[PDB]
Amino acid sequence: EASRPALDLARQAYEAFKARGLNLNMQRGQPADADFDLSNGLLTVLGAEDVRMDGLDLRNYPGGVAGLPSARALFAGYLDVKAENVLVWNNSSLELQGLVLTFALLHGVRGSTGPWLSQTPKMIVTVPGYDRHFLLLQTLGFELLTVDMQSDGPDVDAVERLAGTDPSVKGILFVPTYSNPGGETISLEKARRLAGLQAAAPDFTIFADDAYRVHHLVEEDRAEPVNFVVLARDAGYPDRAFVFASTSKITFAGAGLGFVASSEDNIRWLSKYLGAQSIGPNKVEQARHVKFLTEYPGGLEGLMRDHAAIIAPKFRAVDEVLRAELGEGGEYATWTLPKGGYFISLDTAEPVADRVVKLAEAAGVSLTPAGATYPAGQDPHNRNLRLAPTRPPVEEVRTAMQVVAACIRLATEEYRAGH
Amino acid sequence: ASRPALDLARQAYEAFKARGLNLNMQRGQPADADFDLSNGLLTVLGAEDVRMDGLDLRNYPGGVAGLPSARALFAGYLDVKAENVLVWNNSSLELQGLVLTFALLHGVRGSTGPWLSQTPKMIVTVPGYDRHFLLLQTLGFELLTVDMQSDGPDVDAVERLAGTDPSVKGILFVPTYSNPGGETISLEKARRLAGLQAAAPDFTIFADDAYRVHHLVEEDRAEPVNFVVLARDAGYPDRAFVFASTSKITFAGAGLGFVASSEDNIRWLSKYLGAQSIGPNKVEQARHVKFLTEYPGGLEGLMRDHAAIIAPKFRAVDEVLRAELGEGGEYATWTLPKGGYFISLDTAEPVADRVVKLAEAAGVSLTPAGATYPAGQDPHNRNLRLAPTRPPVEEVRTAMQVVAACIRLATEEYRAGH
Numbered sequence: 104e105a106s107r108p109a110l111d112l113a114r115q116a117y118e119a120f121k122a123r124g125l126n127l128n129m130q131r132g133q134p135a136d137a138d139f140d141l142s143n144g145l146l147t148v149l150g151a152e153d154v155r156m157d158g159l160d161l162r163n164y165p166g167g168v169a170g171l172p173s174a175r176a177l178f179a180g181y182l183d184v185k186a187e188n189v190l191v192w193n194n195s196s197l198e199l200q201g202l203v204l205t206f207a208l209l210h211g212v213r214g215s216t217g218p219w220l221s222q223t224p225k226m227i228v229t230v231p232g233y234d235r236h237f238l239l240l241q242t243l244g245f246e247l248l249t250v251d252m253q254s255d256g257p258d259v260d261a262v263e264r265l266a267g268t269d270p271s272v273k274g275i276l277f278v279p280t281y282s283n284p285g286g287e288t289i290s291l292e293k294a295r296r297l298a299g300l301q302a303a304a305p306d307f308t309i310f311a312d313d314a315y316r317v318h319h320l321v322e323e324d325r326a327e328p329v330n331f332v333v334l335a336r337d338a339g340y341p342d343r344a345f346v347f348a349s350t351s352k353i354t355f356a357g358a359g360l361g362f363v364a365s366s367e368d369n370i371r372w373l374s375k376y377l378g379a380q381s382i383g384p385n386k387v388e389q390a391r392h393v394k395f396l397t398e399y400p401g402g403l404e405g406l407m408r409d410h411a412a413i414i415a416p417k418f419r420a421v422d423e424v425l426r427a428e429l430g431e432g433g434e435y436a437t438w439t440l441p442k443g444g445y446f447i448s449l450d451t452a453e454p455v456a457d458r459v460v461k462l463a464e465a466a467g468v469s470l471t472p473a474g475a476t477y478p479a480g481q482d483p484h485n486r487n488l489r490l491a492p493t494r495p496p497v498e499e500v501r502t503a504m505q506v507v508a509a510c511i512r513l514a515t516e517e518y519r520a521g522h
Numbered sequence: 523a524s525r526p527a528l529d530l531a532r533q534a535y536e537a538f539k540a541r542g543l544n545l546n547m548q549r550g551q552p553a554d555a556d557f558d559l560s561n562g563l564l565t566v567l568g569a570e571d572v573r574m575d576g577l578d579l580r581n582y583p584g585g586v587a588g589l590p591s592a593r594a595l596f597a598g599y600l601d602v603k604a605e606n607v608l609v610w611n612n613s614s615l616e617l618q619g620l621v622l623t624f625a626l627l628h629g630v631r632g633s634t635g636p637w638l639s640q641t642p643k644m645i646v647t648v649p650g651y652d653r654h655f656l657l658l659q660t661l662g663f664e665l666l667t668v669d670m671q672s673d674g675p676d677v678d679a680v681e682r683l684a685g686t687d688p689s690v691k692g693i694l695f696v697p698t699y700s701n702p703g704g705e706t707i708s709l710e711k712a713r714r715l716a717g718l719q720a721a722a723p724d725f726t727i728f729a730d731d732a733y734r735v736h737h738l739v740e741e742d743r744a745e746p747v748n749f750v751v752l753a754r755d756a757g758y759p760d761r762a763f764v765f766a767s768t769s770k771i772t773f774a775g776a777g778l779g780f781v782a783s784s785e786d787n788i789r790w791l792s793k794y795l796g797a798q799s800i801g802p803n804k805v806e807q808a809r810h811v812k813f814l815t816e817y818p819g820g821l822e823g824l825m826r827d828h829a830a831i832i833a834p835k836f837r838a839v840d841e842v843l844r845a846e847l848g849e850g851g852e853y854a855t856w857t858l859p860k861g862g863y864f865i866s867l868d869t870a871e872p873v874a875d876r877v878v879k880l881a882e883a884a885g886v887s888l889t890p891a892g893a894t895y896p897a898g899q900d901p902h903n904r905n906l907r908l909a910p911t912r913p914p915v916e917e918v919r920t921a922m923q924v925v926a927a928c929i930r931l932a933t934e935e936y937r938a939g940h
Contacts, residue, residue: 139580143569146805151561162557162773193611194803201798205623209661220638235800242797243627355580358805379660380619385612385806387564387776 105520113513117462120506125467127503131494132283132445133356137413138493141406142354145395149387153394161387168378169370174360174389177396181316181403182346182364183330189364190373192384196314196349196361197235200276203345203363204243206376207273207308213342213372215306219273220244227265227275229257231448231476231487233283236276236312238479247478248272252282256289259296266302274308280328281315284448284476284489286441294329299338309335311346317407318352320415321442332364341366350392352445353406360392417492420500421447428508435511447490448476454485455514462510468503523937531931535884538924543885545921550701550863550909551774555831559824560772563813567805571812579804586796587788588780592807595814599734599821600764600782601748607782608791610802614732614767614779615653618694621763621781622661624794625691625726631760631790633724637691638662644728645683645693647675649866649894649905651701654694654730656897665896666690670700674707677714684720692726698746699733702866702894702907704859706744716749717756727753729764733862735825736770738833744860750782759784768810770863771824778810835910838918839865846926853929856908865908866894872903873932880928886921 154161157172169175170191179189192199206212208220226245228237229252240247250261257277266272275297279289289297297309311331319325331344342365350359365373399406422440429435438449451459457473464470471489474482490507492500572579575590587593588609597607610617624630626638644663646655647670655665668679675695684690693715697707707715715727729749737743749762762784768777783791817824840858847853856867869877875891882888889907892900908925910918 133582136578139572139578142580143572146567146569146572147565149564151564154557154561154564160554160557162560162776164551164774166775195799198799205627205798208627209623239798242794351582355805356582357584357801358580358803376660380657381613381616383775385776385803387773388803388806 106516107520110516110520113516116509117513120509121466125506127467127495127499128469129490129503130469130471132491133494134352135413135494138410139355141409145354145391148391148395156390161390164382166383166386168374168381168383170384171386171389171393173393177393178362182348184332184364187367188332188370189362190370191360191362191389194358194361196347197239199361199363200310200312200347201239203373208243210376212306212308213369223271225272227262227272229277231284233278234475240276249478252285252287254287256287256293259293262297263300266300266307268303270303273304273306274310276310276312279311279313280326281318281441281444284446286439286444286446288326289329291329295334298331298334298343299340307343309344311344313346313348315444316348317403319407319443320411320418324442326443332366342369354392360389414493416497417500418447420497421490421492421504424501424504425508428505429511435515445491445493447492449488449490450486451511453515453518455518456485456488458514459488459510462513463507466506466510468506470507524934525938528934528938531934534927535880535931538927539884543924545885545917546887546913547921548887548889548909549912551912552770553831553912556828557773559827563772563809566809566813574808579808582800584801584804586792586799586801588802589804589807589811591811595811596780600766602750602782605785606750606788607780608788609778609780609807612775612777612779614765615657617779617781618728618730618765619657621791626661628794630724630726631787641689643690645680645690647695649702651696652893658694667896670703670705672705674705674711677711680715681718684718684725686721688722691722692728694728694730696730696732698731698744699736699859699862702864704857704862704864707747709747712747712749713752716752716761725761727762729762731764731766734766735821737825737861738829738836739860742860760787772810778807832911834915835918838915839908839910839922842919842922843926847929853933863909863911865910867906867908868904869929871933871936873936874903874906876932877906877928880931881925884924884928886924888925
């Protein structure tokens with residue numbers, strides 16, 4: 104297994120890439136300029152004539168903390184629920200998650216017997232997962248209990264074991280459609296089983312961050328998203344599901360719309376605490392998104408297809424280069440080929456993930472730090488690496504992945520040879 | 523007491539009730555004409571104005587603290603530098619709720635622990651703003667009230683409440699054209715609050731400066747104070763959090779909420795906002811920067827245009843109330859503010875709740891009695907908040923004519939034993 108000539112060939116190959124003096128990046132989970140160009144109509148969609156919607160002046164306070172009726176109606180169809188179930192806020196889905204989780208800590212959710220903050224709260228998370236979810240939960244005071252992400256959703260067996268005995272395990276927070284970073288969509292069997300599991304806490308909640316529900320890259324053989332609001336209700340736990348969603352990768356990143364779907368009773372609960380600290384959300388921004396997305400050619404699906412034409416070639420660019428340089432046998436690394444979402448999960452064969460990022464940096468390729476997909480200082484393997492191919496052009500992605508491929512081979516031969 | 527006077531008041535009230543009116547004097551909302559001044563804001567940015575401050579407004583990068591130009595513009599608003607300001611989304615009340623929650627969960631910059639596990643009290647001003655009391659009580663604070671004086675809050679009461687007990691964590695009030703009294707804090711009271719001997723080392727001043735530039739008179743305006751500079755010069759640089767809003771400047775609910783504080787406090791606030799958000803709406807901040815910079819006469823020109831619509835409604839409230847109740851304060855006394863969005867009326871006798879119920883039966887929706895104090899803690903039953911900005915000047919007179927008749931009926935009933 105240990106080979107000196109292969110170590111020399113890997114070193115020379117690495118020297119050749121380093122000598123280019125590159126300055127590429129493969130960690131930015133951001134759309135391209137071409138993606139943002141598609142939504143420029145949104146900036147000028149409303150005017151002096153379009154100031155009134157749903158019997159309300161968009162420029163004045165009245166309307167309710169829940170958002171515009173048309174916004175609540177549009178995103179009801181997005182999340183496969185009714186208007187009464189959906190609440191639309193401002194530019195961030197993560198903010199609305201942080202608000203809901205903070206209200207649960209301060210006041211307790213609908214079916215609770217006290218505030219979560221005083222009960223030593225645990226939150227189940229999925230690994231490899233999203234770095235900002237772990238940071239958010241740990242900032243608010245939740246202890247993270249990790250479960251492994253399987254190909255068709257989380258390890259539900261592990262979720263039932265953790266949630267079954269201890270009442271302090273207050274919930275699960277994960278991405279059900281095209282997960283970050285593995286791109287795994289939760290199966291109906293697992294979604295139904297999550298929606299009705301025997302949990303110790305009677306206020307056990309599912310925080311489904313459905314950030315990539317309609318974000319399809321493949322045209323026909325797509326992932327079918329589940330409906331936790333409907334599944335939880337049919338399972339006998341109507342208040343269990345909070346299905347969060349976003350328009351950041353649909354319209355503008357950071358100038359979109361964050362929103363959540365849940366039971367009508369949970370929306371009243373959430374409306375009380377939002378109402379205590381706010382008169383209401385940006386009603387004019389919600390009206391722009393409603394008017395633009397309704398008036399867009401081919402509707403919402405038409406815009407996501409236009410994004411796919413720009414984004415999909417970048418994903419195949421990562422597959423083609425990485426497969427041609429590392430092979431299909433999985434000698435140096437294995438990786439996902441997701442049908443939607445914004446990321447690709449690459450697992451190096453040997454425990455050299457941190458070495459690949461340090462090598463890549465010196466070559467001029469910024470990769471996501473090793474251990475980012477697990478909770479801070481809790482990566483037991485040192486193999487997983489997140490790749491964000493959506494931002495740069497197809498040419499730069501190829502070059503970046505050739506440099507990453509060369510780093511994986513150099514990192515692998517070092518480990519095998521004792522270096 | 524007088525029976526003939528009670529009959530004349532009854533007959534006058536029945537005349538107004540017989541009309542079958544449907545007026546409102548409690549909505550603290552700008553009029554249709556006020557929002558029309560800012561219709562250019564809707565279409566101010568296009569495909570050519572996508573970039574600003576070396577950043578693409580449609581993309582994530584930029585920082586949690588907001589646009590450099592937004593930070594620079596609202597620095598001038600609050601008389602500070604760009605490093606002191608943090609611009610968020612559409613609500614100042616939200617930004618206060620976020621800052622107060624972070625203090626409860628984590629503690630402010632100079633804290634020894636989280637405020638939540640210290641049985642925290644918050645000093646409030648009475649008569650004050652109903653939403654401040656609701657927000658603080660929702661978050662877990664116990665409200666200790668201090669009386670509002672003509673030139674600001676009762677600072678002697680504030681020192682006594684904050685001096686001994688470390689549990690008393692701050693003061694939350696409006697220093698310019700306060701809700702509802704319209705009082706602006708004096709320089710010596712502002713300086714004295716900025717340097718008072720507080721028991722808690724993390725004592726914080728939550729200055730909701732919601733009406734800083736909202737002037738209704740040309741000459742003899744209120745001069746706002748700079749708590750960020752006053753606190754720094756006093757030796758407590760991290761004490762002041764000066765909040766502000768564009769809600770009554772551009773659009774109500776579609777404006778911008780922001781806060782001014784020490785550079786170190788912004789880093790503290792930026793940590794917890796950053797943990798739950800990539801950043802604020804950068805496109806909305808760009809629209810406000812471009813619109814306000816390009817407006818005829820600047821921001822002061824826009825406030826003077828709002829004054830042209832708003833000021834005549836304030837004068838109508840004063841004219842009708844002086845003519846029907848007199849100037850000697852027999853039935854009631856009231857504020858003649860130089861700016862802001864409200865008028866504070868204090869009835870002579872404790873019959874405020876009766877005046878509101880009488881006004882409701884006569885078709886005039888007034889703010890509920892006791893709204894200006896914390897929930898169930900109104901020891902007088904005299905104060906009533908009046909919001910004259912929303913309806914037209916014609917409807918403001920008619921509404922105040924009915925209210926004037928309700929005060930006289932309620933006064934004659936009390937004196938006569940009913």
